[PDB]
Design a protein around this nucleic acid. Structure first.
Ligand SMILES: Nc1c(C(=O)NCc2ccc(F)cc2F)c(=O)n(O)c2ncc(CCS(=O)(=O)c3ccccc3)cc12
Ligand SMILES: Nc1c(C(=O)NCc2ccc(F)cc2F)c(=O)n(O)c2ncc(CCS(=O)(=O)c3ccccc3)cc12
Ligand SMILES: [Mg+2]
Ligand SMILES: [Mg+2]
Ligand SMILES: [Mg+2]
Ligand SMILES: [Mg+2]
Ligand SMILES: [Mg+2]
Ligand SMILES: [Mg+2]
Ligand SMILES: [Zn+2]
Ligand SMILES: [Zn+2]
Lengths: 367, 182, 367, 182
DNA sequence: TGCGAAATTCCATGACA
DNA sequence: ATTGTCATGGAATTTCGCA
DNA sequence: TGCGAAATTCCATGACA
DNA sequence: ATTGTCATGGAATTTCGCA
């Protein structure tokens, strides 16, 4: 009333342009704008009007404004609309993001064999000799892969298999996702006994185990081809697939995983004989030069509308296994620490500290 | 002549019978001739079946050009000859009652026998679980001649389990008491 | 032998360069190339060598060649390798494509309301009053949507709902996917009785029903928001969601679906009053002008390595629901007719004529 | 004064009781005042519950500014008054025993009564399934005054079901025989 | 004939099983 | 015999209010 | 110092639940 | 407290064989 009273008699108020005539009609302040005659509500009524318009279909900025503009006009309407969108909890946790994650990191290839293993399970598969799963262990530097059939993706089957594997050599680090077999205290106990550091992916992000996940594709693809026109008896083929892939050339590297691990082919078909006249020490010297000079990709260009996390920013974690007709995002949380451009620590919706990938985060809209 | 290389010649032999350990009685010993690298596989018998089963695990990692052995029944069988021919493996046999291989391999098989005996006393039924750490010990043991471990010669790197505290390998006086009692 | 005999004594054969010395050793023809001494096998042995190298891990062009090149050399090796890759049935049906589909068509918006309906089912949802599914009917021109709850996605529930809907008006065309409720002869009978042409999407391609699929997103998104902090009692909310979305502005169009259908808002909140002084005939004249002048998108740019179908080309249809460790593609088939750049008729793997989207096709590699 | 528009005034009334048709006995008639467009809803009684249920289906498509009716019990109840107030609908009542609406609506309700009667004879229990085609016929019927059908005035387009063959609407001599017998 | 701010338009992003 | 769609909110661009 | 063809390298595409 | 990967086959680019 007070601000709108001076407007009717003709005085100037900031925000309201002078060139329009503000009059009273049916007990309401109005104005004759080019679109039509609109009502100017008082300051105290505007938050309620924006909320009523928004809640019709929980619309975003422009769709909400177009409703309000049918009846009303006031200075800086979209500012009051955006104010309410940032306070609507239902919209924040249900709506999708329209900002992509920043470009992926390509972490350095481990320097030596047995510096970092990547392990993961494939399955369930069609039963073969009572076995349903495959433990895949990929050496990060060489790509050399070990396959073990198991009846379940369990800690006991993982320990059994890795005890046989570690007969040849102990690794510094074992990377895995947060599956039940790898997160158990029995597995952490097994790793600490042997001086192995357990490294874990951010949750719900198989890209982080991408070295072994990509090897799973080749394992399944070769198994599929060998089983064409046959029953899926894959248990007997795992030794064949393991040997075949370990001796398969990577076109970009010009080397097989076997060659990167041993520096010399074994008695397999089409074995390389280029280092036949060198001694083993001369051969191992050439291997150390080959290992350091391998091709390594770089971070790709960011997409035109990406976001990168900043300390203190309001962000929302993606709900892992969201139920039907339930929100896809958690409530807003704060970025405590930025571990790298793709990984952050957040103050979780429960209260905990949680390390997450930005692929499972959106920046909270409207600040 | 060409320099000696890994996977040129695997030397295989059986150790046993041993006391039962989770149903296993024998150990198939595979030693790479050039590096001295050792693989150990527990078996229930010194048969062709158990050999073919154990060597199928090994030959899915690396295939040797030659396998050398004594004239034991499992190695001279025609089933094992056909197994070797399918994988392109030449079989090589020592003369009966004259087991000869190489100084490095003879000394390696000596270490394996004595290292097993030292850990058998006290816990003679628990050697199945100790085979991993036995292999790591053997494969990260220093070689006086070549001045590199088997691990170093096979992979071309240092190991994450260097056995710097070299084991005595001989039996103590108390370990002879419990060994002579059994 | 015959070709290689003249090579040893020194005569020139096409393909074999003159500047290298071709000699015999251990009963085999060899040559001292810069990489090393390689064996030249006779013409009759080469197909077997390529097949042996390929079948180790069913590798592509370069990975197969790198095996062969360890031992052998002959003129135009990759030509013989590519020859075998095109004959390997296991590789053709298992491997992935590395050519993207051509850019999407944006078909013309239907000219009038009730020219084309798009119908589809949402569900199953959490049980609400015994109902599990929602029949969604979207008018193509206006976007005006009708919602009906059903207990199953069935023909009888579809006919029940559409009889109530068609009380207001009969459509020319009803578009749907190839779901069981719409492909039944009972539904075709129901449509022919009323003069309605049944249009069907290409199989396993919900993009083609994208008008109603996109509306499903808004229906689910609004239901999710209204049910936050409540049990998922969605049956009572369908009338509310239907009314809310039908009166929601599309920012790019500047109109609600209700406005495009009727040309005037009903007694809903924030109703538009711009045509209050016009007659209905003047109002309907302005509506016909608005309907024709709506924004319409255009075909986006093709990606740098896309393919477009040509008549007579060998293509492979994607397997619909492929079992574990089974190929993802069918055997090669031939393009009979190109209906548009994104849609073709093929001579199916069974023998039938099949209309498919190119999103479910790859061009057979190696010709 | 402002020109008349669709959704300005819905005119509602009940027709019945009719013979049972799949458990339904009455028809709620809703006619838009400006266009003449008709909606028909079958109900089991002329109650406030059945009215609110049927009009909730209609008001999820379009909400009228005013609903007009006679002083029937279902329309004068306080439950229906609260229903209308929640949706911002003004209720308007004709004087008792003087039902007045408009010439276009009076003639429309006349058509509905006679069109139902003509299809009731012969198949008096099957009018539930015929309500769709009855509405299409009424809404694609030519208007002498406005020179456009209700469909044309509501949607601003021609229809895909033009009823060019105009029905006689009167009863034939044989249809009077079966009507007078019942 | 030009400035600062507001209003409008642009459009990449993502999800409809 | 057929074909993607469009709400969303920061950013880019245009228009407004005033001089 | 240059041509046509072969060989090599490039890299978008897609799938690892 | 952590991070995508790489086989694939047409296309683009470089190298080869010869002059
Ligand atoms: N879903 C899983 C995938 C998967 O979806 N792979 C597809 C994929 C997609 C993109 C990509 F780039 C690579 C890629 F392989 C997976 O690969 N693994 O190994 C899993 N392992 C265990 C579990 C159990 C629940 S979990 O909470 O332990 C969890 C959830 C998600 C990931 C990891 C662990 C699920 C998955
Ligand atoms: N899977 C179905 C989806 C679906 O996946 N939508 C996700 C989606 C993904 C991308 C996109 F752009 C839009 C989009 F909605 C779907 O929307 N609908 O309606 C389905 N309706 C029925 C059936 C039953 C088997 S079917 O053979 O009848 C068949 C298979 C596939 C499609 C249509 C019909 C499955 C689906
Ligand atoms: Mg996993
Ligand atoms: Mg995985
Ligand atoms: Mg022996
Ligand atoms: Mg469907
Ligand atoms: Mg769908
Ligand atoms: Mg009445
Ligand atoms: Zn909201
Ligand atoms: Zn193949």
């Amino acid at each position: 009333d007070a601000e709108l009273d001076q407007l009717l008699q003709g005085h100037y108020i900031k925000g309201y342009p002078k060139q329009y005539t503000y009059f009273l009609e049916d007990g309401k302040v109005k104005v004759s704008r080019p679109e039509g005659v609109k009502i100017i509500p008082p300051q105290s009524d505007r938050q309620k009007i924006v909320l009523q318009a928004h809640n019709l279909a929980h619309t975003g900025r422009e769709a909400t404004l177009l409703k309000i503009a049918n009846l009303y006009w006031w200075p800086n309407m979209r500012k009051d609309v955006v104010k309410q969108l940032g306070r609507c909890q239902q919209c924040l946790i249900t709506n999708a993001s329209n900002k992509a994650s920043g470009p992926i990191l390509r972490p350095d290839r481990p320097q030596k064999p047995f510096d970092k293993f990547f392990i993961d399970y494939i399955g369930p598969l069609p039963p073969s000799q009572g076995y349903l799963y495959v433990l895949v262990v990929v050496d990060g530097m060489t790509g050399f892969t070990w396959l073990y059939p198991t009846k379940a993706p369990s800690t006991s089957a993982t320990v059994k298999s890795l005890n046989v594997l570690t007969s040849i050599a102990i690794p510094k680090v074992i990377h895995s996702d947060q599956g039940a077999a790898f997160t158990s205290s029995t597995f952490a106990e097994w790793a600490k006994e042997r001086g192995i550091h357990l490294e874990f992916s951010t949750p719900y992000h198989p890209q982080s185990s991408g070295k072994v996940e990509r090897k799973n594709s080749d394992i399944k693809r070769l198994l599929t081809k060998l089983l064409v026109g046959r029953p899926t008896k894959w248990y007997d083929l795992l030794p064949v697939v393991q040997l075949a892939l370990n001796n398969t050339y990577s076109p970009v590297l010009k080397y097989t995983p076997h060659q990167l691990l041993f520096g010399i082919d074994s008695n397999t078909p089409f074995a390389n004989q280029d280092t036949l006249d060198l001694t083993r020490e001369e051969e191992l010297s050439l291997l150390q030069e080959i290992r350091t000079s391998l091709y390594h990709p770089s971070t790709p260009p960011a997409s035109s509308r990406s976001w990168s996390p900043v300390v203190g920013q309001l962000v929302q974690e993606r709900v892992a296994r969201p139920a039907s007709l339930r929100p896809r995002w958690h409530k807003p949380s704060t970025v405590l620490k930025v571990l790298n451009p793709r990984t952050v620590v957040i103050l979780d919706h429960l209260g905990n500290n949680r390390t997450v990938s930005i692929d499972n985060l959106k920046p909270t809209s409207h600040q | 002549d060409r320099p000696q290389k890994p996977f040129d010649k695997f030397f295989i032999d059986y150790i046993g019978p041993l006391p039962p350990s989770q149903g296993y009685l024998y150990v198939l010993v595979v030693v790479d001739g050039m590096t001295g690298f050792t693989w150990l596989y527990p078996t229930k018998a010194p048969s062709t079946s158990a050999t073919v089963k154990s060597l199928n695990v090994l030959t899915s990692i690396a295939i040797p050009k030659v396998i050398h052995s004594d004239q034991g029944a499992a190695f001279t069988s025609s089933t094992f000859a056909e197994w070797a021919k399918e994988r392109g493996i030449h079989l090589e046999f020592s003369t009966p009652y004259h087991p000869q291989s190489s100084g490095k391999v003879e000394r390696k098989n000596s270490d394996i026998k004595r290292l097993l005996t030292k850990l058998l006393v006290g816990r003679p039924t628990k050697w199945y679980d100790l085979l991993p750490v036995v292999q790591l010990a053997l494969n990260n043991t220093y070689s006086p001649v070549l001045k590199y471990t088997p691990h170093q010669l096979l992979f071309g790197i240092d190991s994450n389990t260097p056995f710097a505290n070299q084991d005595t390998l001989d039996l103590t006086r108390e370990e002879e008491l419990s060994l002579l009692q059994e």
